[PDB]
Write an enzyme that holds these catalytic residues in place. Structure first.
Site, PDB file in Angstrom:
ATOM      1  N   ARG A  62      70.637  53.550  42.104  1.00 46.95           N
ATOM      2  CA  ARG A  62      69.623  54.313  41.205  1.00 46.95           C
ATOM      3  C   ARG A  62      69.042  53.245  40.355  1.00 46.95           C
ATOM      4  O   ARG A  62      69.754  52.321  40.121  1.00 46.95           O
ATOM      5  CB  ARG A  62      70.355  55.271  40.298  1.00 46.95           C
ATOM      6  CG  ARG A  62      71.518  54.913  39.378  1.00 46.95           C
ATOM      7  CD  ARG A  62      71.085  54.270  38.019  1.00 46.95           C
ATOM      8  NE  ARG A  62      71.953  54.298  36.974  1.00 46.95           N
ATOM      9  CZ  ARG A  62      72.298  53.375  35.972  1.00 46.95           C
ATOM     10  NH1 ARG A  62      71.008  52.356  35.647  1.00 46.95           N
ATOM     11  NH2 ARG A  62      73.207  53.281  35.114  1.00 46.95           N
TER      12      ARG A  62
ATOM     13  N   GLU B 159      69.265  60.701  30.086  1.00 42.11           N
ATOM     14  CA  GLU B 159      69.605  59.560  29.366  1.00 42.11           C
ATOM     15  C   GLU B 159      68.191  58.930  29.177  1.00 42.11           C
ATOM     16  O   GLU B 159      67.783  58.434  28.321  1.00 42.11           O
ATOM     17  CB  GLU B 159      70.730  58.610  29.755  1.00 42.11           C
ATOM     18  CG  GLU B 159      70.891  57.224  28.916  1.00 42.11           C
ATOM     19  CD  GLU B 159      71.816  56.386  29.412  1.00 42.11           C
ATOM     20  OE1 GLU B 159      72.969  57.372  29.755  1.00 42.11           O
ATOM     21  OE2 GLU B 159      71.803  55.240  29.341  1.00 42.11           O
TER      22      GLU B 159
ATOM     23  N   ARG C 126      65.242  58.919  36.140  1.00 41.13           N
ATOM     24  CA  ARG C 126      66.376  58.098  37.017  1.00 41.13           C
ATOM     25  C   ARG C 126      65.927  58.206  38.433  1.00 41.13           C
ATOM     26  O   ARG C 126      66.292  59.744  38.948  1.00 41.13           O
ATOM     27  CB  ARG C 126      67.763  58.703  36.668  1.00 41.13           C
ATOM     28  CG  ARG C 126      68.284  58.155  35.227  1.00 41.13           C
ATOM     29  CD  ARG C 126      68.407  56.656  35.147  1.00 41.13           C
ATOM     30  NE  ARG C 126      68.994  56.158  33.848  1.00 41.13           N
ATOM     31  CZ  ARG C 126      70.467  56.233  33.807  1.00 41.13           C
ATOM     32  NH1 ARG C 126      71.248  56.567  34.519  1.00 41.13           N
ATOM     33  NH2 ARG C 126      70.834  55.991  32.285  1.00 41.13           N
TER      34      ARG C 126
ATOM     35  N   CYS D 275      69.502  52.766  26.948  1.00 39.94           N
ATOM     36  CA  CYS D 275      70.616  51.787  26.627  1.00 39.94           C
ATOM     37  C   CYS D 275      70.548  50.544  27.261  1.00 39.94           C
ATOM     38  O   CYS D 275      70.046  50.082  28.182  1.00 39.94           O
ATOM     39  CB  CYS D 275      72.150  52.480  27.268  1.00 39.94           C
ATOM     40  SG  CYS D 275      73.501  51.285  27.202  1.00 39.94           S
TER      41      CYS D 275
ATOM     42  N   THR E 260      72.306  48.512  28.445  1.00 35.34           N
ATOM     43  CA  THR E 260      73.123  48.038  29.736  1.00 35.34           C
ATOM     44  C   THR E 260      72.263  48.479  31.046  1.00 35.34           C
ATOM     45  O   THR E 260      72.686  48.101  31.874  1.00 35.34           O
ATOM     46  CB  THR E 260      74.584  48.681  29.771  1.00 35.34           C
ATOM     47  OG1 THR E 260      74.084  50.372  29.841  1.00 35.34           O
ATOM     48  CG2 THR E 260      75.153  48.876  28.425  1.00 35.34           C
TER      49      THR E 260
ATOM     50  N   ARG F  66      71.994  50.373  39.457  1.00 35.45           N
ATOM     51  CA  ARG F  66      73.386  50.477  39.333  1.00 35.45           C
ATOM     52  C   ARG F  66      73.639  50.881  40.852  1.00 35.45           C
ATOM     53  O   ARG F  66      73.370  52.160  41.346  1.00 35.45           O
ATOM     54  CB  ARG F  66      73.964  51.666  38.414  1.00 35.45           C
ATOM     55  CG  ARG F  66      75.331  51.784  38.527  1.00 35.45           C
ATOM     56  CD  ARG F  66      76.080  52.483  37.399  1.00 35.45           C
ATOM     57  NE  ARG F  66      76.265  53.904  37.699  1.00 35.45           N
ATOM     58  CZ  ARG F  66      77.276  54.264  38.472  1.00 35.45           C
ATOM     59  NH1 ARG F  66      78.232  53.458  38.724  1.00 35.45           N
ATOM     60  NH2 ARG F  66      77.545  55.496  38.698  1.00 35.45           N
TER      61      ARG F  66
ATOM     62  N   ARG G  25      84.457  53.205  37.487  1.00 35.20           N
ATOM     63  CA  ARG G  25      84.226  54.568  36.722  1.00 35.20           C
ATOM     64  C   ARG G  25      84.949  55.627  37.559  1.00 35.20           C
ATOM     65  O   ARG G  25      85.528  55.407  38.973  1.00 35.20           O
ATOM     66  CB  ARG G  25      82.828  55.050  36.846  1.00 35.20           C
ATOM     67  CG  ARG G  25      81.975  53.959  36.023  1.00 35.20           C
ATOM     68  CD  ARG G  25      80.532  54.263  35.928  1.00 35.20           C
ATOM     69  NE  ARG G  25      79.700  53.227  35.137  1.00 35.20           N
ATOM     70  CZ  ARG G  25      78.275  53.561  34.733  1.00 35.20           C
ATOM     71  NH1 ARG G  25      77.802  54.770  34.766  1.00 35.20           N
ATOM     72  NH2 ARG G  25      77.890  52.509  34.247  1.00 35.20           N
TER      73      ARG G  25
ATOM     74  N   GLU H 119      81.010  57.796  34.730  1.00 29.17           N
ATOM     75  CA  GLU H 119      81.595  57.169  33.580  1.00 29.17           C
ATOM     76  C   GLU H 119      82.203  57.901  32.569  1.00 29.17           C
ATOM     77  O   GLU H 119      82.067  59.311  32.506  1.00 29.17           O
ATOM     78  CB  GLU H 119      80.652  56.455  32.621  1.00 29.17           C
ATOM     79  CG  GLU H 119      79.563  57.210  32.176  1.00 29.17           C
ATOM     80  CD  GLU H 119      78.583  56.369  31.362  1.00 29.17           C
ATOM     81  OE1 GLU H 119      78.758  55.273  31.065  1.00 29.17           O
ATOM     82  OE2 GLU H 119      77.616  57.041  30.805  1.00 29.17           O
TER      83      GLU H 119
HETATM   84  N1  LIG Z   1      78.290  56.275  45.219  1.00 22.97           N
HETATM   85  C1  LIG Z   1      78.171  57.517  44.823  1.00 22.97           C
HETATM   86  N2  LIG Z   1      78.543  58.744  45.543  1.00 22.97           N
HETATM   87  C2  LIG Z   1      78.259  59.978  45.024  1.00 22.97           C
HETATM   88  N3  LIG Z   1      78.144  60.076  43.960  1.00 22.97           N
HETATM   89  C3  LIG Z   1      77.919  59.142  43.143  1.00 22.97           C
HETATM   90  C4  LIG Z   1      78.135  57.943  43.372  1.00 22.97           C
HETATM   91  N4  LIG Z   1      78.159  56.926  42.488  1.00 22.97           N
HETATM   92  C5  LIG Z   1      77.626  57.807  41.237  1.00 22.97           C
HETATM   93  N5  LIG Z   1      77.656  59.017  41.417  1.00 22.97           N
HETATM   94  C6  LIG Z   1      77.358  60.124  40.850  1.00 22.97           C
HETATM   95  O1  LIG Z   1      76.301  59.925  39.851  1.00 22.97           O
HETATM   96  C7  LIG Z   1      76.595  60.599  38.897  1.00 22.97           C
HETATM   97  C8  LIG Z   1      76.185  60.289  37.659  1.00 22.97           C
HETATM   98  O2  LIG Z   1      77.438  59.307  37.083  1.00 22.97           O
HETATM   99  P1  LIG Z   1      77.255  58.084  36.029  1.00 22.97           P
HETATM  100  O3  LIG Z   1      78.224  57.477  35.708  1.00 22.97           O
HETATM  101  O4  LIG Z   1      76.702  58.881  34.712  1.00 22.97           O
HETATM  102  O5  LIG Z   1      75.981  57.269  36.602  1.00 22.97           O
HETATM  103  P2  LIG Z   1      74.413  56.875  36.570  1.00 22.97           P
HETATM  104  O6  LIG Z   1      73.954  57.743  35.246  1.00 22.97           O
HETATM  105  O7  LIG Z   1      74.283  55.553  36.146  1.00 22.97           O
HETATM  106  O8  LIG Z   1      73.648  57.502  37.674  1.00 22.97           O
HETATM  107  C9  LIG Z   1      77.918  61.447  38.612  1.00 22.97           C
HETATM  108  O9  LIG Z   1      77.910  62.860  39.140  1.00 22.97           O
HETATM  109  C10 LIG Z   1      78.679  60.629  39.926  1.00 22.97           C
HETATM  110  O10 LIG Z   1      79.742  61.240  40.504  1.00 22.97           O
HETATM  111  N1  LIG Z   2      74.472  53.835  29.023  1.00 23.89           N
HETATM  112  C1  LIG Z   2      75.415  54.320  29.704  1.00 23.89           C
HETATM  113  N2  LIG Z   2      75.177  55.467  30.424  1.00 23.89           N
HETATM  114  N3  LIG Z   2      76.673  53.899  29.898  1.00 23.89           N
HETATM  115  C2  LIG Z   2      76.871  52.767  29.057  1.00 23.89           C
HETATM  116  C3  LIG Z   2      77.028  53.180  27.458  1.00 23.89           C
HETATM  117  C4  LIG Z   2      77.967  54.384  27.533  1.00 23.89           C
HETATM  118  C5  LIG Z   2      78.199  54.799  25.889  1.00 23.89           C
HETATM  119  N4  LIG Z   2      77.406  54.667  25.001  1.00 23.89           N
HETATM  120  C6  LIG Z   2      79.630  53.442  25.603  1.00 23.89           C
HETATM  121  O1  LIG Z   2      80.819  53.683  26.084  1.00 23.89           O
HETATM  122  O2  LIG Z   2      79.195  52.592  24.777  1.00 23.89           O
HETATM  123 MG   LIG Z   3      75.003  58.485  33.467  1.00 21.61          MG
END
Ligand SMILES: Nc1ncnc2c1ncn2[C@@H]1O[C@H](COP(=O)(O)OP(=O)(O)O)[C@@H](O)[C@H]1O
Ligand SMILES: NC(=[NH2+])NCCC[C@H](N)C(=O)O
Ligand SMILES: [Mg+2]
Length: 356
Positions: free
Chosen positions: A125, A224, A228, A270, A272, A279, A308, A313
């Site tokens: 993503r 966020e 995305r 954020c 990060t 990611r 995670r 996360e």
């Molecule tokens: N490789 C993956 N396969 C399936 N689902 C995933 C995978 N990686 C992350 N996810 C999903 O993405 C969603 C968002 O998770 P999050 O940790 O907030 O990541 P981000 O916001 O960076 O996409 C969650 O539902 C998680 O289960």
């Molecule tokens: N940006 C994001 N979705 N994850 C990283 C930071 C998460 C949260 N603010 C913290 O643990 O500080």
């Molecule tokens: Mg997220």
């Protein structure tokens, strides 16, 4: 800044100091020196250090603890953001600048687990912010709607594999929303770290998800970050997943103006998620290496990877399924980012096979 905020700031600083076992980057880098140098500062949009650290102060279990209410914040409160960004991304000096967008030679990417006994699904993503609109904390209910319309309209032009439908969160049945979350497609609701940063106002107004019928290409609207852009599927075919992402991002960018910074690359809420905003992750099972999660996380960190939970996360792993991805996003190209995940995962799988 008003004196109420100043009083809240002084109180927050004290809370951070008194929290002996707090391991957030905020606590670590917000020294009294740094605090005093920026506590009286305010951005053009009226953002203060409080808007920046509020989430970290309220959620002591935070890993980072800060967010940028607006683009100007990254510099206005630079003495805090800089060391934190340098720490999290594994090195990024004040003189450093994020390299130009570079997807790299996709043909060098490979299938991560041919036999299919470890990896369950692969996902990549990116995040983008709309030029003209500030980050969550400074957005009005009207702006959320404006953004939703602009994005959804733009995505209606997606063709072929990327062709899809926009599903507004407002009006979405509870059953459908929960299924989309359980299936790992839709963002979760009620994140405590985002709430305290005042990033969930007017929920679920202007929020939603766009996805092709197959659900291999999705776009989160107004969570966020403004957007995305996601590419995912079962198995470990990173090449196909990445290629799809690249195609989608390239096309969407030719239609929508996104905020890019000379030093921080693509801007996000954020720190990060700056730079590549990428990611790349996999849902994987590694029973031997996972047995003592300490070693799992210690092994992952050496490859610059983050661990995670299955639901994302701040969550636990279910049925031994972990979310492992590249931790770094700034100071390296999109290619280097996805490569860190590929390289690390390939090795962790080798280690798992050799483990006692
Ligand atoms: N490789 C993956 N396969 C399936 N689902 C995933 C995978 N990686 C992350 N996810 C999903 O993405 C969603 C968002 O998770 P999050 O940790 O907030 O990541 P981000 O916001 O960076 O996409 C969650 O539902 C998680 O289960
Ligand atoms: N940006 C994001 N979705 N994850 C990283 C930071 C998460 C949260 N603010 C913290 O643990 O500080
Ligand atoms: Mg997220």
């Amino acid at each position: 800044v008003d004196q109420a905020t100043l009083d809240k700031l002084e109180a927050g600083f004290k809370k951070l100091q008194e929290a002996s076992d707090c391991k957030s980057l905020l606590k670590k880098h917000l020294t009294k020196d740094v605090f005093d140098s920026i506590k009286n500062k305010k951005t053009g949009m009226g953002a203060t250090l409080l808007d920046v650290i509020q989430s970290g102060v309220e959620n002591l279990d935070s890993g980072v603890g800060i967010y940028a209410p607006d683009a100007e914040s990254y510099r206005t409160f630079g003495p805090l953001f800089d060391p934190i960004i340098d720490d999290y991304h594994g090195g990024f000096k004040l003189t450093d600048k994020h390299p130009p967008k570079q997807w790299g030679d996709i043909n060098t990417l490979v299938g991560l687990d041919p036999a299919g006994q470890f990896i369950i699904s692969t996902r990549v993503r990116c995040g983008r912010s709309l030029q003209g609109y500030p980050f969550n904390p400074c957005l009005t209910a009207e702006q959320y709607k404006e953004m939703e319309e602009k994005v959804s309209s733009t995505l209606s032009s997606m063709e072929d594999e990327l062709k899809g439908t926009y599903y507004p969160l407002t009006g979405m049945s509870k059953a459908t929303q929960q299924q989309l979350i359980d299936d790992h497609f839709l963002f979760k609701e009620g994140d405590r770290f985002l709430q305290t940063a005042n990033a969930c106002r007017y929920w679920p107004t202007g929020r939603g998800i766009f996805h092709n019928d197959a659900k291999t290409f999705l776009v989160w609207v107004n969570e966020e970050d403004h957007l995305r852009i996601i590419s995912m599927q079962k198995g470990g075919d990173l090449k196909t997943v990445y290629k799809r992402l690249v195609t989608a991002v390239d096309n969407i960018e030719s239609k929508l103006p996104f905020s890019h910074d000379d030093r921080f690359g693509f801007l996000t809420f954020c720190p990060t998620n700056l730079g590549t905003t990428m990611r790349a992750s996999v849902h994987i099972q590694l029973p031997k290496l996972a047995k003592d999660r300490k070693v799992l996380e210690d092994i992952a960190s050496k490859f610059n990877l983050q661990v995670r939970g299955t639901r994302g996360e701040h969550t636990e792993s279910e049925g031994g399924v972990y979310d492992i991805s590249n931790k770094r996003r700034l100071g390296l190209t999109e290619y280097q980012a996805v490569r860190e995940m590929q390289d690390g995962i390939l090795e962790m799988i080798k280690m798992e096979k050799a483990a006692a």
